[PDB]
Amino acid sequence: EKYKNAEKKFWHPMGSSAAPHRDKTLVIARGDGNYITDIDGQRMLDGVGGLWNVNIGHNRASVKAAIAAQLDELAYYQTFDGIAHPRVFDLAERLTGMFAQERMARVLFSSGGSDAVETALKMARQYWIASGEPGRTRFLSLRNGYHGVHMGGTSVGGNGVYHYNHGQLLAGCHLLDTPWLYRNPWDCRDPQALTAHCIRQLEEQIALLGAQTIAALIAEPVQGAGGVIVPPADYWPRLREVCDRHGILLIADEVVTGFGRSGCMLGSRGWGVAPDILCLAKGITAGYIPLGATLFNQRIADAIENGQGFSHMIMHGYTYSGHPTACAAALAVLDIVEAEDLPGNAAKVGAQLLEQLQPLVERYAVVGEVRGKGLMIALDLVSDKRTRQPLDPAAGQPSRIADEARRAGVLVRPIGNKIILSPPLTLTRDEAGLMVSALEAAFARCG
Amino acid sequence: EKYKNAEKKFWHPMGSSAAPHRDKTLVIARGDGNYITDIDGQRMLDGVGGLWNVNIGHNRASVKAAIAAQLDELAYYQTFDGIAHPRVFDLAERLTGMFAQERMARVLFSSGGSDAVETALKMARQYWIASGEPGRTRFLSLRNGYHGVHMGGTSVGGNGVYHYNHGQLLAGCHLLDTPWLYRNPWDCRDPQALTAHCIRQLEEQIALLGAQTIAALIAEPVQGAGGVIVPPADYWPRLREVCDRHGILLIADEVVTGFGRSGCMLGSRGWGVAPDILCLAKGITAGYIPLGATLFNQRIADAIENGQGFSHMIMHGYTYSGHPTACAAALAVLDIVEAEDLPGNAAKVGAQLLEQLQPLVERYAVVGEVRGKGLMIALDLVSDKRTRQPLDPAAGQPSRIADEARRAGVLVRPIGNKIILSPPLTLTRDEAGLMVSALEAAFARCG
Amino acid sequence: KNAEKKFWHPMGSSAAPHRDKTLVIARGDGNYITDIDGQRMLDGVGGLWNVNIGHNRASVKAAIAAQLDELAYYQTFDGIAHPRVFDLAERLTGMFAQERMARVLFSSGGSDAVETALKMARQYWIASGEPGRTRFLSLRNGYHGVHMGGTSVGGNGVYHYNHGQLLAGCHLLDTPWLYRNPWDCRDPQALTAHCIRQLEEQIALLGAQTIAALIAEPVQGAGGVIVPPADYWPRLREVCDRHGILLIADEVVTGFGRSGCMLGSRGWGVAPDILCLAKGITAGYIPLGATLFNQRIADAIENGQGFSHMIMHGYTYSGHPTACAAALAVLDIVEAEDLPGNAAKVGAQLLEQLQPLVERYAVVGEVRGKGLMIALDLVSDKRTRQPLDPAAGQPSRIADEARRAGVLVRPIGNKIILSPPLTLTRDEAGLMVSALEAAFARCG
Amino acid sequence: SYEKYKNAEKKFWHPMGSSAAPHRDKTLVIARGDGNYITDIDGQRMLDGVGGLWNVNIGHNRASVKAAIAAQLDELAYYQTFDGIAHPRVFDLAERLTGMFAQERMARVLFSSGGSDAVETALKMARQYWIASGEPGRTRFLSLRNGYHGVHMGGTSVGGNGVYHYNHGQLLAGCHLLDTPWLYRNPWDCRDPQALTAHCIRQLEEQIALLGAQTIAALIAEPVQGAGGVIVPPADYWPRLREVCDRHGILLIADEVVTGFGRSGCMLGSRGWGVAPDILCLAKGITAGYIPLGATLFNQRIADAIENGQGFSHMIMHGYTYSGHPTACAAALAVLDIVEAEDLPGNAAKVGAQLLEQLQPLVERYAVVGEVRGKGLMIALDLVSDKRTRQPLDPAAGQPSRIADEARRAGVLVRPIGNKIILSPPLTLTRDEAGLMVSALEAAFARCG
Numbered sequence A, B: 001e002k003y004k005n006a007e008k009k010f011w012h013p014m015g016s017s018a019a020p021h022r023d024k025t026l027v028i029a030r031g032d033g034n035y036i037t038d039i040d041g042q043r044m045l046d047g048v049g050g051l052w053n054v055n056i057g058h059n060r061a062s063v064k065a066a067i068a069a070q071l072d073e074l075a076y077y078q079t080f081d082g083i084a085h086p087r088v089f090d091l092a093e094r095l096t097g098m099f100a101q102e103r104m105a106r107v108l109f110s111s112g113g114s115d116a117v118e119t120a121l122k123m124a125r126q127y128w129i130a131s132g133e134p135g136r137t138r139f140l141s142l143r144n145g146y147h148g149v150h151m152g153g154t155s156v157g158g159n160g161v162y163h164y165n166h167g168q169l170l171a172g173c174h175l176l177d178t179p180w181l182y183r184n185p186w187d188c189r190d191p192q193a194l195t196a197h198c199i200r201q202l203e204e205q206i207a208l209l210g211a212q213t214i215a216a217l218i219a220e221p222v223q224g225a226g227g228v229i230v231p232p233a234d235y236w237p238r239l240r241e242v243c244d245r246h247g248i249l250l251i252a253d254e255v256v257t258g259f260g261r262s263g264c265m266l267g268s269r270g271w272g273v274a275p276d277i278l279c280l281a282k283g284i285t286a287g288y289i290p291l292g293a294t295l296f297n298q299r300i301a302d303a304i305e306n307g308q309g310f311s312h313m314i315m316h317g318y319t320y321s322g323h324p325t326a327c328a329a330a331l332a333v334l335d336i337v338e339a340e341d342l343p344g345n346a347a348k349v350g351a352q353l354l355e356q357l358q359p360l361v362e363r364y365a366v367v368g369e370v371r372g373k374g375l376m377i378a379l380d381l382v383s384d385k386r387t388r389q390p391l392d393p394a395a396g397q398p399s400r401i402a403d404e405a406r407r408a409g410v411l412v413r414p415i416g417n418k419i420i421l422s423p424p425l426t427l428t429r430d431e432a433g434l435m436v437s438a439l440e441a442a443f444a445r446c447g
Numbered sequence C: 001k002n003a004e005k006k007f008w009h010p011m012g013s014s015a016a017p018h019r020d021k022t023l024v025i026a027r028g029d030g031n032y033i034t035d036i037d038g039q040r041m042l043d044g045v046g047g048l049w050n051v052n053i054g055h056n057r058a059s060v061k062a063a064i065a066a067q068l069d070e071l072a073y074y075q076t077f078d079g080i081a082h083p084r085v086f087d088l089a090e091r092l093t094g095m096f097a098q099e100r101m102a103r104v105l106f107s108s109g110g111s112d113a114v115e116t117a118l119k120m121a122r123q124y125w126i127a128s129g130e131p132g133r134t135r136f137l138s139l140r141n142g143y144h145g146v147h148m149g150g151t152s153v154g155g156n157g158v159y160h161y162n163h164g165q166l167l168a169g170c171h172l173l174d175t176p177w178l179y180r181n182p183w184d185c186r187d188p189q190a191l192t193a194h195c196i197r198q199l200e201e202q203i204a205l206l207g208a209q210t211i212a213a214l215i216a217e218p219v220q221g222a223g224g225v226i227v228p229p230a231d232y233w234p235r236l237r238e239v240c241d242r243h244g245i246l247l248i249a250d251e252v253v254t255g256f257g258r259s260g261c262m263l264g265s266r267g268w269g270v271a272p273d274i275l276c277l278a279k280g281i282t283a284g285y286i287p288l289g290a291t292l293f294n295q296r297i298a299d300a301i302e303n304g305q306g307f308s309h310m311i312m313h314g315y316t317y318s319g320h321p322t323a324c325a326a327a328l329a330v331l332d333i334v335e336a337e338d339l340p341g342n343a344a345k346v347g348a349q350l351l352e353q354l355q356p357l358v359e360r361y362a363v364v365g366e367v368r369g370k371g372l373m374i375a376l377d378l379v380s381d382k383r384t385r386q387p388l389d390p391a392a393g394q395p396s397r398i399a400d401e402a403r404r405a406g407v408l409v410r411p412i413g414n415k416i417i418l419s420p421p422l423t424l425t426r427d428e429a430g431l432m433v434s435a436l437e438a439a440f441a442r443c444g
Numbered sequence D: 001s002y003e004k005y006k007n008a009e010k011k012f013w014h015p016m017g018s019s020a021a022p023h024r025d026k027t028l029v030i031a032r033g034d035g036n037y038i039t040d041i042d043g044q045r046m047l048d049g050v051g052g053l054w055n056v057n058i059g060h061n062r063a064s065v066k067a068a069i070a071a072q073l074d075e076l077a078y079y080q081t082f083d084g085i086a087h088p089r090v091f092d093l094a095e096r097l098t099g100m101f102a103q104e105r106m107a108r109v110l111f112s113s114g115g116s117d118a119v120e121t122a123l124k125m126a127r128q129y130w131i132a133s134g135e136p137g138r139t140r141f142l143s144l145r146n147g148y149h150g151v152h153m154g155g156t157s158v159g160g161n162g163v164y165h166y167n168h169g170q171l172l173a174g175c176h177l178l179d180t181p182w183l184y185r186n187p188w189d190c191r192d193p194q195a196l197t198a199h200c201i202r203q204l205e206e207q208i209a210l211l212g213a214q215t216i217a218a219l220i221a222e223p224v225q226g227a228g229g230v231i232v233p234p235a236d237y238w239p240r241l242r243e244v245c246d247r248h249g250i251l252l253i254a255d256e257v258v259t260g261f262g263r264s265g266c267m268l269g270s271r272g273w274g275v276a277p278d279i280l281c282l283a284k285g286i287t288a289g290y291i292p293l294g295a296t297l298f299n300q301r302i303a304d305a306i307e308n309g310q311g312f313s314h315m316i317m318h319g320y321t322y323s324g325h326p327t328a329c330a331a332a333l334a335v336l337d338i339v340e341a342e343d344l345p346g347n348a349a350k351v352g353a354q355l356l357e358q359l360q361p362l363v364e365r366y367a368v369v370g371e372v373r374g375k376g377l378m379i380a381l382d383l384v385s386d387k388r389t390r391q392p393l394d395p396a397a398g399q400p401s402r403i404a405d406e407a408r409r410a411g412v413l414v415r416p417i418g419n420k421i422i423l424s425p426p427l428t429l430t431r432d433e434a435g436l437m438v439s440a441l442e443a444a445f446a447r448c449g
């Protein structure tokens, strides 16, 4: 109506602010189920699921009803020292129940994934102080890992584009190579050998720093924004092994994988591993209300709550920690996740979608490989297949392919040289077929 | 009603996690207007306004309706590179218009005040890189300043309790003394002389660090969680001037003071000052939906959007940046702020409340002074009025006084040695009188 | 010497044409130095606060030659040593038994000695089971060398501007400088109270459990000869103890008598936990530095658990035999000739004899000192104490004219610094007063 | 007599050793040195197989150097070199060094008293170079695993061996470590020099891309890594280091504290690989240990930028009281005369090759000797528990020290660092002395291997 031509007074995250690029906009006006409609009336399948978070689809009546009911009762009250409200009790019980297998004991709520990560990092340090080991302060993380954009989360991030414009951040953060078969420093194409390489490097890094100086390691069970990097099956079991050997806390960044996208209620659980700390957001409310959560296992909960002196004071949290309306939405969302077995649907429909996309590798030289697990999938676009040289996004080919997919009726997300598929976990087989058709059309014209 | 006895599976921010303290809970079930009700049916005036944020009162029909309407249209969609939706256009236009006097040009939305600060700090760094001065990296802030609990915000915080349990954070953050008449290093009780002292210290710190290494200074127009410290009237003008003398960006943390609590739509505007960056949250949605906002003036917008190479890429933001439902709530909330002149009501009723509390200084030895501006007020409790020695919060006397106020029907917040009053800005004179009576009863019993 | 200069002068502009000029010193004897043209001047700066016994002492030269004949150098790393390092370590721990000094870690200069103090301070807390103790406190205008650690805790900006971000967790306090301080307080006891309260507030802000050490000069040298109130160091010691913080006394300048006592800290009646020594320890004849640790620190590390008892810090030239032999001879002279006492007596005479300059010349704001470290603080306005700007060059012009009058003095910022050998006689003190009177008469 | 030094209480600490009792009670007390032999307080003589600490490169007790020292003490033992003041010897030595390193276009020297100083000076002045150049964002440092660069906080921050870090907490931020091109132990298990180089260079490129070249000030490396275990890089590694640095404008700092002045067979290790760095760090052999001296040299590129720096950026506010020490400079001039007159770089190359060849049979004869590597007269015996797993001996079990102890009784003092026995004798070593080192080591492994 007026959004096509007006000057833009906000900035898009993860994009150029330069004109004329900044003048261009795709304005989404409504969402229903797994389809979204722009201001011109053009409808498209939500192949990006909002931002890997609208996992139950748009406009679920039961979630809207839960929100409205809580607004009528208590939209907001704080949860600071000694004060709380029913919904934060309800959700904390629910989450610790859902993750009893991992022995999760306490939750610290927030409003997003960057919050949940920042919380894990800060509280990991407090765990060690409360335990009498204040020298345990350094953090380990993986190349291509993405953990939000707070200064702590950014410090442990493994992609340079998020660093270049912000100077020196947290010291004592150390990066390990990721077990990425398609691109790794050893050109190692054997998953088991690659795991062995990464674990040896990890041990050598720990030996170099001294285990007694390392607080925690943080990693995504499947690395999302870094390019949907699916680790070898034995990597996470060995991550847990190394952490146990040296007492280091294992932080699973489950912001994307939490609540079913990779085929299991937790990505780490999918690999047969129990972390010490869980970071959750995105799918926890399916995007309806901002919410994040950091969960701590009994080991951590007991140490902090029994800390001497000031070490048991938890001087960290947010005005909106435990927001009643966000909690009410999460409770309704999680009911749907479990009721409709969306982790199982993601595993099944995701496996089909991955298989049906493999012909693209054959047919188009620019498609280096297609990888995924559940309903997170990446098309890794390269200029030639020997060195795996990524296309440069500034040349615009990934965006043009995406544009053509949108014209074919499916919205997908280009991140760097990769096309990311992360649709709602309610995706059906027919809708998966529509995604394949739109993508084949896009590469046919712009590949 | 298992909320009374069940094990608590969440942690309270800003409180002891040790048993038996953590077993105690005040469970708030409902809220309407300026009153809240616990699970036992006990009503109390919300003297803390949630957490300085329920500024229009609880349970406003028009805000609830705006939320429901947006949920029916589009609960959520992203705003990353090239994608947006109607509501974020609407609110960005609204905010830049409200703050046209301050030449605000661009908004980067988030979900809270800690986000808004963290965004300010990171984008301040990027401004200087885009401007060709990547040596500009250090941050200045004030003792007793509070700027959230992300690692960046924590690094510039001016109260030790938020640092003790989390190790070394951001380097290059330097604290200045706050122009606090009641407690300052000069024992200076003249506002004009105190300002001069602080400005001299600031100049000396800049000279020591080198202006060319300093990115920005961040400050609250009235310091909230630090104890409602109202600066001399001429401090913020001089603060603005020294920053400009050296090109340093002035970040106004308006998370509490933004939208009227101190008597003006902006605290900085109330002092006659235009910052380069504004941080907003809390009152922006009156707590109904999590939302934060960081606003940048034309100076900053022009530099970044014209930056060379990668410096115009804004690789910072959050999944819920620009959340449609949060934006819809904000639009409805701001209509009420402006329609009902809540900044004006805060100025008038707050001044009344402040004068009505002064007799407490007379009557009770523990009350060192009572200060405030608008509807943020602090009772500064001391063991000795000559040295102004603060009571120890861990000894519990502030909490015991607060407990008695609750029994009298008014919930107030002890932060350290101070009792904080921060009720909704719709507070009436009658309700202010009720607050005075409850506090008189509390000190009579526990003072 | 009209050739291109292939070395850089520390603490100066490297730009041409400034860099083309040089005062080339060829000879030194007693308290005088002579350039290549025979231009002769009293060494009013004592080299760099270090030629404390004068130039060309036969007994020191002989001690050096004797050690060169026996063993010029051998290492002292794990399990290996040599006679001289035994001798000097015994000598120093004996001289500083009052302070309960137990172990020495030698080096080659003051920056080394500071850097060693900082690193070993960190190790003390790790060995003690408090590895969260990492932050360092220091004073504005403090100078602690130019290694990255020493620079990080320095309190003068000119040493930071060109080197970017260094060590994190270093926090500066205001210095108890009577002539210029944030309280405009010229009363020793009141200024002390102001500074101590500030110190307490910063510790509360950081948390004692995160702070490794505080480092300070008993008299701040390069910062402008700032003599603290008499009760400052006692209360400094007490606040540090209140919180367990290690007190590092940077005695690189004050060590071995310049301020009137064998240690500046001892002169204030204080025992630090760590001593940093250099400059005067060898009177400049051979590079040497020393860091001494009290029984508290030595015992904790030697009983440390795990790896905390491994001292993986030190220098190839730690314990250098020839440097140690030189120090033993130098220290013999310090004690034999009671040079701390001479610095006290003659320094007081010089200080009193300079006071008329304050009255006589508007540019001389004040003259302060203790022993034989003295500063003339030059100002454009005595009401505000506005310092002259050195970039306008008046301090250098005054210094130049002092040189023509036969005395070399050092302009640092707006201050003229006097730090001559501790063998200074009453006549030579008078010569310094005279040369300065001549300089201000023309260039003041 | 030296009797009073036996059993006497030690009031000093040994660097790089346990301070715990009873270990600290043991001491080998050296009483005198002559040529390449040292004598302990019991009268036992041994070849100085460690050359002091890779620094007594011309031998002990050189009359001409002692005379040069005594002569300068009589003339001017010390005077400062700060702003506008200097003395003849610092002119002499600066000219000498810039002349010796004209091939590398070295233009300015900033003197100090040791290798840690020289590294620290390089790091700080690298920072100043970029600020003077208008690029104050260039602040990060790159270095190699197993690299050793002294023990100041800067040098320690870029060090690549954990034992020097464990006890000192967090130091300089923005320091990043790369794997070293170490044939015997590397993440690729690659024993092919060209292939290992390619692996390391690609890792370096990836690290630069991740950080952003515009944030990186300098890379520092040893032409042969000394204390890390005498790791001789592939021949094409340093040429490719220079390439990558040039690709991104990064300053190349050659830590020549050990290799400077001939130990690896060339007056500079970097020159030995055919490379010109931007900054040279020198110490140890520059005075052969007679007087502490270090030097950091800067090429014309750096010198011009700083001397033309705008605002305050041309002020060099870094240096040491003993920078340019007249007596140290006089000693250096006499030492360097000997280095060139006796062609000690050539002797190190020739005798070093002989010694290295003669030691290879030990690999076959003794299971604990994993390999013997070296270049010139820096050589390491890399001790392992068995050649199948290549597991390094753990020094805390004490076998490397026991082997060293046996070598000492056989008449040669050698250095155990971790699992490695280091040989670094004076560069005046003769063929007979090389043979003595082989025999003493043969005896040591026969008894304790």
Ligand SMILES: *Cc1c(COP(=O)(O)O)cnc(C)c1O
Pocket (backbone or CB within 6 Å): A111, A112, A113, A114, A115, A117, A146, A147, A148, A149, A220, A224, A225, A253, A254, A255, A256, A281, A282, B317, B318, B319, B320
């Ligand atoms: C998206 C994401 C985050 C950040 O979540 P926000 O809500 O955008 O702050 C953190 N970690 C991972 C793995 C993510 O995908």
Ligand SMILES: *Cc1c(COP(=O)(O)O)cnc(C)c1O
Pocket (backbone or CB within 6 Å): A317, A318, A319, A320, B111, B112, B113, B114, B115, B117, B146, B147, B148, B149, B220, B224, B225, B253, B254, B255, B256, B281, B282
């Ligand atoms: C409350 C507050 C914040 C943090 O806001 P959150 O929503 O709790 O993250 C930041 N700055 C100030 C001045 C605040 O009062």
Ligand SMILES: *Cc1c(COP(=O)(O)O)cnc(C)c1O
Pocket (backbone or CB within 6 Å): C049, C108, C109, C110, C111, C112, C114, C143, C144, C145, C146, C217, C221, C222, C250, C251, C252, C253, C278, C279, D319, D320, D321, D322
């Ligand atoms: C001169 C000085 C130093 C540095 O000594 P150098 O030998 O120049 O490295 C350190 N601290 C103080 C107080 C000094 O005066």
Ligand SMILES: *Cc1c(COP(=O)(O)O)cnc(C)c1O
Pocket (backbone or CB within 6 Å): C314, C315, C316, C317, D113, D114, D115, D116, D117, D119, D148, D149, D150, D151, D222, D226, D227, D255, D256, D257, D258, D283, D284
């Ligand atoms: C020995 C060494 C140093 C340190 O030299 P010192 O004189 O001990 O300070 C620095 N770098 C390297 C490569 C060294 O071998």
